[PDB]
Amino acid sequence: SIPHLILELLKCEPDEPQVQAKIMAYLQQEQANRSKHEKLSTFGLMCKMADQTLFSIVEWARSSIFFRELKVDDQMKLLQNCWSELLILDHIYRQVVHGKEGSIFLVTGQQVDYSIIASQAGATLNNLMSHAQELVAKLRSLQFDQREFVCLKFLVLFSLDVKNLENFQLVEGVQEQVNAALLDYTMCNYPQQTEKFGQLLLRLPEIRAISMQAEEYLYYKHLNGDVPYNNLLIEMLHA
Amino acid sequence: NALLRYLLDKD
Numbered sequence: 001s002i003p004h005l006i007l008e009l010l011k012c013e014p015d016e017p018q019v020q021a022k023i024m025a026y027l028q029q030e031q032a033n034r035s036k037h038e039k040l041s042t043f044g045l046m047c048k049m050a051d052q053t054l055f056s057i058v059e060w061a062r063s064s065i066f067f068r069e070l071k072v073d074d075q076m077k078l079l080q081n082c083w084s085e086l087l088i089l090d091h092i093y094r095q096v097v098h099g100k101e102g103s104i105f106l107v108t109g110q111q112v113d114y115s116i117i118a119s120q121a122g123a124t125l126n127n128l129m130s131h132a133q134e135l136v137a138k139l140r141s142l143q144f145d146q147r148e149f150v151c152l153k154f155l156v157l158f159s160l161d162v163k164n165l166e167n168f169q170l171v172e173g174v175q176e177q178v179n180a181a182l183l184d185y186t187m188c189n190y191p192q193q194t195e196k197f198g199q200l201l202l203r204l205p206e207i208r209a210i211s212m213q214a215e216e217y218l219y220y221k222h223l224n225g226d227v228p229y230n231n232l233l234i235e236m237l238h239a
Numbered sequence: 240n241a242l243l244r245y246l247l248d249k250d
């Protein structure tokens with residue numbers, strides 16, 4: 001039915017209605033606490049929402065099985081290695097589960113019409129969101145489920161390519177065991193999709209491609225002086 | 240990356 005390991009990963013999933021409410025409240029109070037003289041721009045609010053999204057990802061990781069056993073230095077190295085990929089994967093899965101045609105479901109728990117955000121976003125960001133939507137559609141066609149999602153998330157987080165980790169053994173172990181569990185799970189639960197395991201893994205390079213697009217966009221905003229100082233996403237980029 | 244360390248260490 002379900003591998004013990006996957007069940008344990010799932011126990012660490014965030015409380016989504018709580019995260020949604022928390023981020024929504026933060027963004028509301030931020031606008032509120034600002035006087036008419038200092039109201040935040042659209043990009044400004046996008047940046048704050050993105051920061052909060054990444055804060056919640058870090059919070060998730062910190063409390064998660066396996067990751068919580070690592071020294072803070074190793075935790076930073078893993079997150080530094082995959083932060084943009086986790087942001088994209090989080091966004092994509094949110095759309096897989098909650099998305100409606102013509103709309104984007106935000107981390108705040110709200111649907112926004114796609115044409116509205118795309119009008120504000122411009123060509124570059126619209127291209128990125130469109131790429132992400134094609135992956136959403138692909139994952140839906142594959143019948144991507146939450147068990148597979150959490151496996152991919154841990155594979156992204158515990159990546160072999162992380163440099164200078166002290167406890168690399170955990171990366172080795174998580175990689176070996178989560179790949180094995182994902183295979184067992186997909187073969188058991190989706191017997192009619194004989195290639196599902198490999199098809200899910202092949203989405204990871206695509207997630208990485210979208211994350212590069214995101215980093216590029218962020219970097220050009222930063223070159224333009226548009227990204228506020230100590231925005232976490234730009235701090236992650238600065239490395 | 241000071242902010243990241245803070246997020247991981249606080250509380």
Ligand SMILES: C[C@H](CCC(=O)NCCC[N+](C)(C)CCCS(=O)(=O)[O-])[C@H]1CC[C@H]2[C@H]3[C@H](O)C[C@@H]4C[C@H](O)CC[C@]4(C)[C@H]3C[C@H](O)[C@]12C
Pocket residue numbers: 212213215216219
């Ligand atoms: C080359 C620049 C880094 C510039 C830099 O090192 N800035 C430090 C301060 C600058 N200095 C003042 C010292 C010198 C002046 C530069 S000034 O910018 O002020 O003219 C960095 C910053 C963002 C980088 C990439 C993105 O991640 C996304 C994507 C990831 C892929 O994997 C590879 C491709 C791509 C596009 C990457 C290419 C390149 O790798 C980037 C552009």
